Design a protein around this ligand. Structure first.
Ligand SMILES: CC(C)=CCn1cnc(N)c2ncnc1-2
Ligand SMILES: [Cl-]
Length: 446
């Protein structure tokens, strides 16, 4: 087991990682900005290093500062959590070059799956179903681009290869908009990624977002841990997640899971990862792979019993997976509501000082948050301040427990989305299940 690690993150996920480390007897080094001295996990960590001022560019994105912290404390590995540098292949490469273990895949694998064109080609080769598309980048020949659009069939969508997560894409429903849509998508990618590569895919009108959790070790084992539905979104930001996904049969779960596990073997994947799909008319279509742990991992933990952070750490130390595929069973149902410090009318972040705080409790209730009474949510980072996860023997019990837990949650002094989450739990279409990626925005419009 790893002697000591740097937790290269903040907020709820840093706390999540710290607890896993403590369970395994791994010493913790909490690197933090000057604005984050009073983070719960920093206060609980074995050692702390202030790596820079509040702005992320000088702290949580500061590669030299993070590697220096690892060097100075005699740490042996770095866990990047999610966001920040977790999908930064150059960072992973520098970590391993500097002699530390990166808790994630090989840098080459991060790079492969961080290029959407190259990622799709690899998934297609491995036998994972993808969206019909250009299977290659678009050039400047509009005769050729119209022909690709014709072959796919309108509507199509133009997507940046260096993008992802709903960033940098345009829907095209006819030839008259194709040239300008390609040109604008290209320009925005060049400005944002210094990578002007774009591709074309079939546009799916009303899909659900369904993603598959995998784990792969250094001994050749690769397993899938069922799926999560993350269709409840606003501007491509997930708001509620659940596992398993309503209406997915054991046969479908098996079909898609095995293809994901096989893909991991083919690409030499290591650690935790997620295959994201659009699901429509009973069919899966790969869009992207997240080569890292995700925000919503706890719903999969609740339904499988597998501690995914502890698995990441075990894999990094050179231990095989603690469970075999035949030992992975979906039991019960879990729902996650993201708790955001945000204004209810503008949806902009709403930082400030929490004056009273009370967490819900009870059977099947899991609260993931660093916040406490008297804690100030700083303005420099993401609006998500906690995650409420509720488990039940079925989806209805999970939803009932969430309603009750949301009612016990007290966060005064700042504006939050608790009331909105209560509205969603009480929504008759959500209670039925299987709502698509457009539903929340449709509801919020009403
Ligand atoms: C609603 C929207 C802008 C996109 C939803 N959507 C539809 N079709 C595809 N092929 C996609 N790839 C990523 N997202 C996709
Ligand atoms: Cl994430």
């Amino acid at each position: 087991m790893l002697d000591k690690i740097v937790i290269a993150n903040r907020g709820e996920i840093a706390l999540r990682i710290l607890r896993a480390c403590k369970e395994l007897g791994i010493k913790t080094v909490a690197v933090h900005s000057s604005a984050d001295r009073d983070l719960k996990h920093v206060l609980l960590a074995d050692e702390t290093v202030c790596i820079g001022p509040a702005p992320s560019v000088k702290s949580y994105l500061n590669i030299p500062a993070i590697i220096s912290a690892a060097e100075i404390t005699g740490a042996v590995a770095i866990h990047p959590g999610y966001g920040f540098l977790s999908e930064n292949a150059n960072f992973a490469e520098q970590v391993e070059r500097s002699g530390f273990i990166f808790i994630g895949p090989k840098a080459e694998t991060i790079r492969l799956m961080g290029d959407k064109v190259s990622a799709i080609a690899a998934m297609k080769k491995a036998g994972v179903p993808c969206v019909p598309g250009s299977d290659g980048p678009l050039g400047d020949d509009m005769d050729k681009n119209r022909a690709i659009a014709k072959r796919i069939g309108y509507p199509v969508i133009i997507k940046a290869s260096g993008g992802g997560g709903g960033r940098g894409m345009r829907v095209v429903r006819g030839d008259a908009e194709l040239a300008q849509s390609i040109s604008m998508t290209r320009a925005e990618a060049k400005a944002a990624f210094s990578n002007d590569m774009v591709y074309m895919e079939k546009y799916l009108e009303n899909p659900r977002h369904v993603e598959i959790q995998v784990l792969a070790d250094g001994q050749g084992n690769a397993i899938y841990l069922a799926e999560r539905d993350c269709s409840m979104q606003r501007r491509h930001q997930k708001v509620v997640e659940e596992a398993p996904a309503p209406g997915i049969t054991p046969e479908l779960r098996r079909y898609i899971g095995e293809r994901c596990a096989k893909a991991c073997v083919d690409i030499g994947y290591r650690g935790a990862g997620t295959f994201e799909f659009l699901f429509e008319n009973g069919e899966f279509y790969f869009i992207e792979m997240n080569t890292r742990i995700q925000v919503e991992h706890p719903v999969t933990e609740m339904i499988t019993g597998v501690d995914l952070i502890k698995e990441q750490l075990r894999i990094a130390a050179g231990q095989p997976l603690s469970i075999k595929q035949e030992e992975v069973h979906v039991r019960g149902h879990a729902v996650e509501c993201r708790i955001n410090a945000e204004d209810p009318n503008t949806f902009l972040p709403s930082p400030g000082k929490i004056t009273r705080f009370h967490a819900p409790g009870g059977f099947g209730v899991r609260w993931e948050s660093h916040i406490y009474a008297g804690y100030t949510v700083p303005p420099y980072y993401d609006s998500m301040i906690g995650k409420l996860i509720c488990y039940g023997e079925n989806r209805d019990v999970a939803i009932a427990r969430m309603k009750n837990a949301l009612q016990e949650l007290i966060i005064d002094g700042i504006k939050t989305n608790v009331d909105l989450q209560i509205r969603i739990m009480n929504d008759e279409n959500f209670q039925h299940g299987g709502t698509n990626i457009h539903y929340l925005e449709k509801k919020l419009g009403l």
